[PDB]
Design an enzyme around this catalytic site. Structure first.
Site, PDB file in Angstrom:
ATOM      1  N   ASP A  96      23.031  22.899  34.648  1.00 16.38           N
ATOM      2  CA  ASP A  96      22.609  24.182  35.158  1.00 16.38           C
ATOM      3  C   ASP A  96      23.742  24.434  36.152  1.00 16.38           C
ATOM      4  O   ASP A  96      24.620  23.578  36.308  1.00 16.38           O
ATOM      5  CB  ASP A  96      21.269  24.092  35.885  1.00 16.38           C
ATOM      6  CG  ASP A  96      20.830  25.436  36.438  1.00 16.38           C
ATOM      7  OD1 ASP A  96      21.406  26.464  36.016  1.00 16.38           O
ATOM      8  OD2 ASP A  96      19.919  25.466  37.285  1.00 16.38           O
ATOM      9  N   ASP A 154      23.330  26.568  39.585  1.00 19.86           N
ATOM     10  CA  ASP A 154      22.790  26.520  40.944  1.00 19.86           C
ATOM     11  C   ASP A 154      22.259  25.137  41.298  1.00 19.86           C
ATOM     12  O   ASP A 154      21.502  24.520  40.532  1.00 19.86           O
ATOM     13  CB  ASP A 154      21.676  27.555  41.128  1.00 19.86           C
ATOM     14  CG  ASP A 154      22.183  28.982  41.021  1.00 19.86           C
ATOM     15  OD1 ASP A 154      23.379  29.224  41.284  1.00 19.86           O
ATOM     16  OD2 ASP A 154      21.374  29.875  40.692  1.00 19.86           O
ATOM     17  N   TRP A 164      22.184  29.233  45.405  1.00 23.98           N
ATOM     18  CA  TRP A 164      21.755  30.087  44.304  1.00 23.98           C
ATOM     19  C   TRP A 164      22.759  31.236  44.318  1.00 23.98           C
ATOM     20  O   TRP A 164      22.869  31.959  45.305  1.00 23.98           O
ATOM     21  CB  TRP A 164      20.335  30.624  44.539  1.00 23.98           C
ATOM     22  CG  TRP A 164      19.264  29.587  44.403  1.00 23.98           C
ATOM     23  CD1 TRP A 164      19.028  28.790  43.321  1.00 23.98           C
ATOM     24  CD2 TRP A 164      18.275  29.237  45.379  1.00 23.98           C
ATOM     25  NE1 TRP A 164      17.960  27.966  43.560  1.00 23.98           N
ATOM     26  CE2 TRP A 164      17.477  28.217  44.818  1.00 23.98           C
ATOM     27  CE3 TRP A 164      17.986  29.686  46.675  1.00 23.98           C
ATOM     28  CZ2 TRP A 164      16.408  27.635  45.505  1.00 23.98           C
ATOM     29  CZ3 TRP A 164      16.922  29.106  47.362  1.00 23.98           C
ATOM     30  CH2 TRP A 164      16.146  28.090  46.773  1.00 23.98           C
ATOM     31  N   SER A 192      21.957  28.234  32.498  1.00 24.09           N
ATOM     32  CA  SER A 192      21.527  28.762  33.793  1.00 24.09           C
ATOM     33  C   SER A 192      20.592  29.969  33.664  1.00 24.09           C
ATOM     34  O   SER A 192      20.767  30.798  32.777  1.00 24.09           O
ATOM     35  CB  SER A 192      22.765  29.175  34.594  1.00 24.09           C
ATOM     36  OG  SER A 192      22.420  29.930  35.746  1.00 24.09           O
ATOM     37  N   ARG A 193      19.618  30.074  34.566  1.00 25.16           N
ATOM     38  CA  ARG A 193      18.667  31.190  34.530  1.00 25.16           C
ATOM     39  C   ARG A 193      18.918  32.312  35.537  1.00 25.16           C
ATOM     40  O   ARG A 193      18.017  33.106  35.817  1.00 25.16           O
ATOM     41  CB  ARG A 193      17.245  30.668  34.727  1.00 25.16           C
ATOM     42  CG  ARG A 193      16.632  30.043  33.490  1.00 25.16           C
ATOM     43  CD  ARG A 193      15.298  29.418  33.840  1.00 25.16           C
ATOM     44  NE  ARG A 193      14.444  30.376  34.530  1.00 25.16           N
ATOM     45  CZ  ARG A 193      13.541  30.043  35.444  1.00 25.16           C
ATOM     46  NH1 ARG A 193      13.374  28.771  35.780  1.00 25.16           N
ATOM     47  NH2 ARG A 193      12.816  30.986  36.033  1.00 25.16           N
TER      48      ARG A 193
END
Length: 162
Positions: A11, A13, A20, A69-70
């Site tokens: 990911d 962050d 973030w 990543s979201r």
């Protein structure tokens, strides 16, 4: 020694960098003459210290590397990967909001790597749980990536293959 994963997923962050990207910084970013990366306001953006070597080790081992990543700050996330010269290590990048299960289904589809042959590093419990149900070896991390986190994760993957 032990079996290597066919795909290492990270990911962004709190994995490659201590923040973030959609909250703590203000894109766009740029490279400063003092050797740092700065955001629109002038903040000193840094990666966890051993991230470059972590990706370099996976490269040396021939392990394909991808991002999952979201974040909604997609443009900023990609710009950081480029400015820190980390983009060259990634064969695929899934960066967008939504269940990370969708990111992995696309990683699985495009790479052809079965879920059981993947190792994933993330600090967010939500993601470790969601992706784990796919059979992926998920490594819950704290204080970001480090060579220790990476090597222990590879051992965990090997153990799971047994």
């Amino acid at each position: 020694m032990t079996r290597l994963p066919k795909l290492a997923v990270f990911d962004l962050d709190y994995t490659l960098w201590p923040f973030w990207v959609d909250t703590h910084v203000d894109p766009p970013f740029h490279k400063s003459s003092d050797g740092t990366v700065r955001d629109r306001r002038g903040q000193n953006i840094q990666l966890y210290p051993e991230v470059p070597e972590v990706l370099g080790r996976l490269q040396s081992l021939g392990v394909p590397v991808a991002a999952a990543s979201r974040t909604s700050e997609i443009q900023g996330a990609n710009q950081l990967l480029e400015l820190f010269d980390l983009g060259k290590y990634f064969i695929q990048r899934e960066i967008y909001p939504g269940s990370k299960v969708t990111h992995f289904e696309r990683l699985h589809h495009k790479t052809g790597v079965p879920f059981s042959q993947m190792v994933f590093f993330d600090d967010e419990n939500r993601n470790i749980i969601d992706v784990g149900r796919l059979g992926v070896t998920c490594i819950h991390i704290r204080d970001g990536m480090s060579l220790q986190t990476l090597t222990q994760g590879l051992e965990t993957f090997a153990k799971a293959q047994a």
